[PDB]
Design a protein around this ligand. Structure first.
Ligand SMILES: *[C@@H]1O[C@H](CO)[C@@H](O[C@@H]2O[C@H](CO)[C@@H](O[C@@H]3O[C@H](CO[C@@H]4O[C@H](CO)[C@@H](O)[C@H](O[C@@H]5O[C@H](CO)[C@@H](O)[C@H](O)[C@@H]5O[C@@H]5O[C@H](CO)[C@@H](O)[C@H](O)[C@@H]5O)[C@@H]4O)[C@@H](O)[C@H](O)[C@@H]3O)[C@H](O)[C@H]2NC(C)=O)[C@H](O)[C@H]1NC(C)=O
Ligand SMILES: *[C@@H]1O[C@H](CO)[C@@H](O[C@@H]2O[C@H](CO)[C@@H](O[C@@H]3O[C@H](CO[C@@H]4O[C@H](CO)[C@@H](O)[C@H](O[C@@H]5O[C@H](CO)[C@@H](O)[C@H](O)[C@@H]5O[C@@H]5O[C@H](CO)[C@@H](O)[C@H](O)[C@@H]5O)[C@@H]4O)[C@@H](O)[C@H](O)[C@@H]3O)[C@H](O)[C@H]2NC(C)=O)[C@H](O)[C@H]1NC(C)=O
Ligand SMILES: *[C@@H]1O[C@H](CO)[C@@H](O[C@@H]2O[C@H](CO)[C@@H](O[C@@H]3O[C@H](CO[C@@H]4O[C@H](CO)[C@@H](O)[C@H](O[C@@H]5O[C@H](CO)[C@@H](O)[C@H](O)[C@@H]5O[C@@H]5O[C@H](CO)[C@@H](O)[C@H](O)[C@@H]5O)[C@@H]4O)[C@@H](O)[C@H](O)[C@@H]3O)[C@H](O)[C@H]2NC(C)=O)[C@H](O)[C@H]1NC(C)=O
Ligand SMILES: *[C@@H]1O[C@H](CO)[C@@H](O[C@@H]2O[C@H](CO)[C@@H](O)[C@H](O)[C@H]2NC(C)=O)[C@H](O)[C@H]1NC(C)=O
Ligand SMILES: *[C@@H]1O[C@H](CO)[C@@H](O[C@@H]2O[C@H](CO)[C@@H](O)[C@H](O)[C@H]2NC(C)=O)[C@H](O)[C@H]1NC(C)=O
Ligand SMILES: *[C@@H]1O[C@H](CO)[C@@H](O[C@@H]2O[C@H](CO)[C@@H](O)[C@H](O)[C@H]2NC(C)=O)[C@H](O)[C@H]1NC(C)=O
Ligand SMILES: *[C@@H]1O[C@H](CO)[C@@H](O)[C@H](O)[C@H]1NC(C)=O
Ligand SMILES: *[C@@H]1O[C@H](CO)[C@@H](O)[C@H](O)[C@H]1NC(C)=O
Ligand SMILES: *[C@@H]1O[C@H](CO)[C@@H](O)[C@H](O)[C@H]1NC(C)=O
Ligand SMILES: *[C@@H]1O[C@H](CO)[C@@H](O)[C@H](O)[C@H]1NC(C)=O
Ligand SMILES: *[C@@H]1O[C@H](CO)[C@@H](O)[C@H](O)[C@H]1NC(C)=O
Ligand SMILES: *[C@@H]1O[C@H](CO)[C@@H](O)[C@H](O)[C@H]1NC(C)=O
Ligand SMILES: *[C@@H]1O[C@H](CO)[C@@H](O)[C@H](O)[C@H]1NC(C)=O
Ligand SMILES: *[C@@H]1O[C@H](CO)[C@@H](O)[C@H](O)[C@H]1NC(C)=O
Ligand SMILES: *[C@@H]1O[C@H](CO)[C@@H](O)[C@H](O)[C@H]1NC(C)=O
Ligand SMILES: *[C@@H]1O[C@H](CO)[C@@H](O)[C@H](O)[C@H]1NC(C)=O
Ligand SMILES: *[C@@H]1O[C@H](CO)[C@@H](O)[C@H](O)[C@H]1NC(C)=O
Ligand SMILES: *[C@@H]1O[C@H](CO)[C@@H](O)[C@H](O)[C@H]1NC(C)=O
Lengths: 479, 479, 479
């Protein structure tokens, strides 16, 4: 009779966006992983000290609040609000210092201490009874007040250093500590990776009179000392300098950058594990991309995008006579038939395997391209700590928008390449079948062939594995 | 004889840019509208007070200059330059104050007042005879100078607040108002969405000695008071704080964000209305995009681009013996003929209607994609006032360049999609013709068919609406 | 017998990336030129004064160190480090001043002077015996100290101006020069294209006690004068103002922007010349692009990218029976044969010339598009001096990354268009030859033609130039 080849007919699932048109496909999936309901924290420590500690207490190493100086830092951390009351000095913080201490208290790296070098360079630190509990600060009060000096040091990592002043309230104490007249404004400057400065004066003179008002009172009500702080940034190789006068204070620790913990905001659930956790839930295992609005995450995490996109999973539906599809039911994607169902139709696994492998290879190449673009766009030697510190209070990252646009443009190319590869596979298969059939077999040109003899179902399935031979079918002539 | 189908031959208009090649088409149009010569301002109010007022006068609510406190603010406003002299105090403005006063005096929104709360918190304002004309300012002069305080308030909108000081020139007045020593430098700080500060000292002392020199003298020459102003930004939800001392002044009005009026620079023409207006001319009704160098506009306006692009409007000219075209004249785009002109050639409205629908749909999809990209790139909850304020003195916007590049890329995809859709329509039509014609008719493969019988002009017309029947044409045999 | 046409078979060289697939081509090249080992500086003079001069000495016009005031400024310059010791005053520079002096000492433009205007406005400059060697500065010491003034001037070019103070160490000298009390802080402010300021106070008072410590001591150890400098920026059309008090100093020279010299870091070799020189080597003549990590170069230099990409140079290898190629060896790309080698195979130069011209035209269009995009992305009126000054200490330019991505995307389109044009040329050639042979010749559809008669080597050879005629080959009939 006649024989035809084509694709198995399956119900249409959806539509994908090719470069030149929209293609109807029998199966599609989503490239990026989706956030889940809870946080999977099986087999991991949770640090919760929000009942006794504060943001500044960890920095200043108050008793019982020593997260930055721990040994095995937990991945999840939580503590009191920024305006908590400590048991030592009253404190005031610059906006930059606030934005940087929201982050630096929970870095998971190793913090370098240089208080000793200061001790041998400038003698013993200042001593006061109001800071008995607190144990991490150097107070520069030389005998020859004020005696300005410049402290030079080659940094050991890339981090943040907190510097400023520690001054009392009464004029007598201020004069006795600084040795300067009350009507004098004096500066403390920091020159590392960037230049920063802060100004001070007497208690009843600007701008310290606002430092008293805006200060955060301590737990004990009989302390007159206020510590005013500001932040400066260093570099691993470069040398940083601090301009120190009498009364100046500095927290002797370089809070090295790196990955920093997250503060849970949703339900914490045990008995389940994951690999990429966020502040609002974890993510499924082995995701190529992540639906997230930031680069802050813990564990092994792929690049983040803002919205999902659809990629192909089956094949194009090029059918509704013979239109290209096969009415029979077969176990595969491509097949050959003689308009008979049940025994006269067979499927070939080679084309299906080639199509699946092509889909997988195209997806892998696209993922590699996206990863390379992400690395170029953020930098190979990046760090979440500095990436969020430099952002500040801004919650919109335009680089994420650029990355999302790049992924959106890449998905269309993926679909186009997959469809073109499928078309090439089909053309090669039909040309091979035509060559195998021989030159005495008429070709319809639409994928069907019309033999000069009768071709039963054995005639059909013989072609399936390519063992068909012309000799056994020479008998009889028909058109 | 024989029958053929194809497209009507029309003169070639030009070339458009497809992804893979350049396509010669019989018609194109431009995606974006063009600025017109004049401004169409029919049925809209125009404000012009450049002969009596100035930028600062509107802020300070001078008698006869109260644009920000109006009820129905006109969309076109004009006033005197920045350095115009008011009838009240001599004034000095920081560069930020100038850059923000260029905008905030002509906002079309509603401004919020908080002078009352200041009155109850810190008593009555200071009194001076030199500011009788002015009516919008609060002068903080407590009984016990200096008496520093901090003013906290939760804002109601997103805008700018102008603060600073108001001090005399003589040393006696400065000492009487401020209560500070002349050899003292004090500060006024603003802490809202961002940190700002301003410094003052004695009249014969830096930095005020330059404040007198750079001040703008008033109309009356017997005033010794200078008001020094600076700008700060607030946020709708968060709380802003100002550090006040004796002598500090603040303008109690939050100039809320929103659209702001344009200052016409071309001829204003009545008797004609429009929808989108610019400072250099109006724009046509219902434009998909605007050829503009900035995002400042009034009325309903689409996204702005920097240069025009060509989109397809006809169809590709795939012809110069039959090449694909039809030499005869028909009312449409596609047609069928038997190499006869006038009565043997017939046209079908279905294919032309489908092509027009395809063009419209592709253009609509492109416009939607461009709008979505514009929204992503600027932000859904944006505001022209803050967008132009943050630019400052910069006249080049890189985001407009990015959007223009995106639109230039999108137009090529639009042309490719339209051409592919036209090709698909043509292929489907010729397949339908071949199946309707029958299996006894030879197919040339180039769109022509060669029948076994003679096919006159009535035969050609029969196929046109599909009522062709093979019975009445059985007679005679020809090849 | 039969005749076939196709492409000459050549070994596969490489693979290029098309929009929808990966293409195998017989020849490819690289879009951008590559840096070489040395610097080809034949016929160019080199300035080297690293043993006597310093960065600041060139600005201050020390004897024997006058690069900024030359007439024929060399393209290659080298001098001592920033912290060298001059023979006059001790000097201190701000971070901005350091970053801008790293550049402005070697600009190749013409620098504008305005010292005469200052002299005729405010009298003669201050006189000190410690700066006899130095010759480029204006010291402001009015008779009636302090006597603050504001200096207004309309700038002549776009450049940088260095301003600050020149103050002694002893209290008596400071009081005599400035005329102020020691416990006073006074500011010098600059308002041009931007705002800048610097502060000064007594010697035993902040922030000058740190200026003394951080200063660079001069060669002579008996000097007490320290010059503290800072940088401000001006615009060609606008007016800049400086707030001058007694004791302030300004370097009266606008260092106009433009191309600035490069400091060699590799071996300098004469006896060889090039067109574009970088700081680490020259580049090949007539390069379309440059593999460079910055926009700093001397001479005529094309736009810079970060990595090379591959573009097609031959043609696609669409073959492994006849598959499309020609087994014979011919001098060209396209040819016609009758399965005979040596005399039955001939090639046509028309198709080869058309293909080469298409490749050249596509590359030229791509280069034009890239240059235009570079112009939009940096600006038509750009300047290397300001483009590198605004960067500061940042070594990564995101704009270069964006341009590299744009070039990478453009290369794919170039390959696609070239392949499409080659396919169109082949289709036109085969259609033309099929038309030439006539309607009595059988068409295989794969590019091979099968004649009713025998077609010897002379027959196939005559077809190449199109002089084939039917009359002399009618003899004999064969299928
Ligand atoms: C110390 O630093 C911390 C981080 O460095 C600071 O943490 C930030 O705190 C903010 C306030 O507490 C917080 O902002 C809130 O975010 C919440 C997010 O939860 C929402 O969940 C919804 C579903 O239920 C989402 O619809 C919603 O937005 C979506 O986000 C998806 C990704 O998760 C996107 O794919 C979607 O497009 C969608 O829209 C996005 O919204 C983003 C804004 O949230 C926007 O930037 C983005 O462009 C998309 O448009 C969201 O996921 C909200 O419910 C709250 O209303 C509020 O916005 C920040 O998220 C915290 N940052 C991080 C990294 O967690 C901490 O405040 C600071 N401490 C101090 C004292 O300053
Ligand atoms: C308070 O704020 C106001 C707005 O926030 C400030 O208004 C700005 O004032 C500037 C100074 O007066 C003004 O700059 C001038 O702009 C004029 C524009 O008119 C030109 O018309 C030409 C045709 O006749 C055009 O060729 C020209 O440029 C074109 O613009 C097209 C759009 O119409 C673009 O598509 C084209 O690409 C082309 O090139 C653009 O040029 C832009 C610069 O003008 C450039 O930024 C852009 O990237 C393109 O390259 C232009 O349209 C010029 O004639 C003058 O020479 C001068 O440049 C600003 O345009 C005003 N801004 C707005 C939004 O109106 C106001 O100054 C401020 N107050 C104070 C005191 O500062
Ligand atoms: C006054 O101003 C001057 C300029 O205005 C300042 O000059 C800069 O000084 C820096 C410090 O010395 C200097 O940084 C060094 O650069 C060297 C470059 O040599 C390398 O050679 C390698 C091969 O041997 C390359 O692999 C290497 O990087 C490559 O660069 C290619 C371009 O040619 C890229 O295509 C490649 O991708 C590759 O990687 C790049 O690296 C870049 C950083 O180097 C990076 O920005 C880029 O994104 C790519 O990732 C490089 O070519 C290094 O050997 C040194 O280790 C150091 O990095 C700057 O290059 C100088 N700038 C210029 C324009 O010359 C001067 O410091 C300043 N003075 C003061 C006192 O501040
Ligand atoms: C997701 O991946 C995590 C890996 O981090 C899986 O957790 C581990 O699963 C293996 C196999 O059961 C266990 O042997 C490990 O003990 C698990 N890790 C921990 C820390 O408990 C997790 O099972 C995966 N989940 C899914 C659904 O695949
Ligand atoms: C452009 O659109 C504007 C709408 O803003 C048209 O102005 C209105 O036109 C209608 C119809 O004639 C009138 O009923 C309204 O009174 C008009 N509004 C005003 C304020 O006058 C305008 O006619 C349109 N112009 C063109 C050429 O289409
Ligand atoms: C690269 O281009 C430079 C252009 O400056 C060539 O240098 C010139 O070459 C011409 C041709 O011989 C000479 O007449 C000039 O005298 C050369 N200029 C100088 C300053 O020497 C250089 O020869 C080119 N090199 C190569 C390899 O093409
Ligand atoms: C193909 O063969 C069948 C019978 O096997 C016949 O009915 C049909 O007409 C043939 N097709 C063509 C195009 O002749
Ligand atoms: C498409 O396939 C998915 C996965 O099998 C299924 O959940 C969905 O219902 C399907 N949709 C249609 C329209 O067939
Ligand atoms: C501290 O801040 C929290 C919010 O972060 C607020 O609810 C609380 O009232 C504040 N406490 C004080 C004493 O200001
Ligand atoms: C403060 O100033 C007075 C007068 O100027 C001076 O006598 C006194 O020594 C100053 N105080 C200090 C600590 O120098
Ligand atoms: C088509 O028919 C015409 C006459 O009706 C004839 O001249 C022509 O040769 C035919 N075409 C072919 C390819 O046979
Ligand atoms: C193309 O069409 C437009 C629209 O009518 C017309 O203005 C223009 O002159 C045409 N171009 C040519 C070359 O005919
Ligand atoms: C005020 O500014 C204008 C520019 O808008 C200028 O022409 C005028 O001279 C200025 N007036 C004074 C007194 O400087
Ligand atoms: C100014 O300073 C002197 C001493 O320096 C002091 O006696 C006087 O009280 C000060 N003025 C005020 C208003 O406090
Ligand atoms: C083409 O002609 C050759 C001999 O010239 C012959 O062997 C071959 O069978 C012909 N092709 C076809 C399809 O018949
Ligand atoms: C491709 O051609 C280039 C240029 O001749 C040559 O250097 C390279 O070795 C070739 N590659 C292969 C695989 O033949
Ligand atoms: C000057 O700077 C160089 C590096 O530029 C450094 O090696 C040298 O030690 C410095 N000299 C002094 C005295 O600090
Ligand atoms: C310094 O201050 C004293 C008292 O405050 C004053 O008498 C003297 O005039 C001041 N110095 C100058 C140069 O004015």
């Amino acid at each position: 009779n006649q024989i035809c080849i084509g694709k198995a007919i399956k119900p249409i699932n959806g539509t994908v966006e090719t470069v030149s048109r929209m293609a109807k496909v029998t199966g599609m999936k989503k490239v990026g992983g989706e956030r889940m309901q809870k946080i999977c924290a099986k087999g991991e420590q949770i640090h919760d000290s929000s009942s006794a500690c504060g943001i500044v207490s960890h920095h200043l190493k108050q008793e019982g609040c020593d997260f930055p100086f721990l040994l095995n830092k937990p991945k999840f951390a939580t503590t009191g609000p920024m305006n908590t009351s400590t048991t030592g000095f009253n404190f005031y913080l610059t906006e930059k210092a606030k934005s940087w201490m929201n982050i630096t208290w929970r870095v998971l790296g190793e913090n370098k201490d240089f208080g000793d070098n200061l001790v041998e360079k400038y003698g013993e630190s200042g001593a006061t009874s109001e800071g008995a509990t607190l144990k991490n600060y150097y107070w520069y009060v030389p005998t020859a007040k004020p005696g300005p000096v410049v402290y030079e040091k080659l940094a050991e990592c890339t981090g943040t250093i907190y510097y400023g002043a520690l001054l009392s309230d009464a004029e007598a104490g201020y004069i006795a500590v600084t040795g300067r007249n009350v009507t004098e404004r004096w500066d403390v400057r920091f020159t590392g990776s960037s230049e920063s400065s802060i100004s001070f004066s007497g208690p009843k003179q600007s701008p310290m009179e606002e430092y008293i008002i805006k200060s955060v009172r301590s737990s004990v009500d009989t302390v007159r000392n206020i510590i005013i702080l500001d932040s400066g940034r260093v570099k691993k190789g470069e040398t940083f300098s601090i301009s120190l006068s009498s009364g100046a204070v500095v927290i002797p620790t370089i809070f090295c950058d790196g990955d920093f913990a997250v503060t849970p905001q949703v339900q914490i659930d045990k008995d389940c594990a994951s690999d990429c956790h966020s502040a609002y839930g974890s993510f499924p295992n082995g995701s190529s991309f992540i639906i997230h609005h930031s680069v802050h995450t813990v564990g092994s995490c792929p690049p983040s995008i803002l919205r999902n996109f659809d990629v192909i999973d089956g094949y194009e539906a090029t059918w509704e006579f013979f239109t290209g599809g096969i009415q029979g039911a077969i176990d595969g994607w491509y097949g050959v038939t003689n308009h008979d169902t049940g025994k006269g139709t067979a499927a070939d696994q080679t084309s299906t395997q080639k199509a699946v492998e092509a889909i997988t290879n195209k997806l892998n190449e696209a993922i590699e391209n996206g990863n390379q673009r992400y690395n170029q766009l953020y930098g190979l030697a990046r760090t979440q700590a500095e990436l969020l510190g430099n952002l500040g209070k801004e919650v919109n990252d335009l680089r994420l928008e650029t990355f999302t646009e790049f992924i959106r443009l890449e998905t269309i190319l993926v679909n186009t390449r997959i469809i073109e590869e499928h078309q090439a596979i089909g053309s090669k298969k039909k040309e091979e079948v035509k060559r195998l059939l021989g030159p005495n077999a008429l070709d319809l040109g639409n994928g069907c062939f019309n033999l000069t003899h009768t071709c039963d179902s054995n005639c059909v399935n013989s072609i399936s594995r390519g063992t068909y031979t012309r000799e056994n079918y020479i008998h009889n002539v028909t058109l």
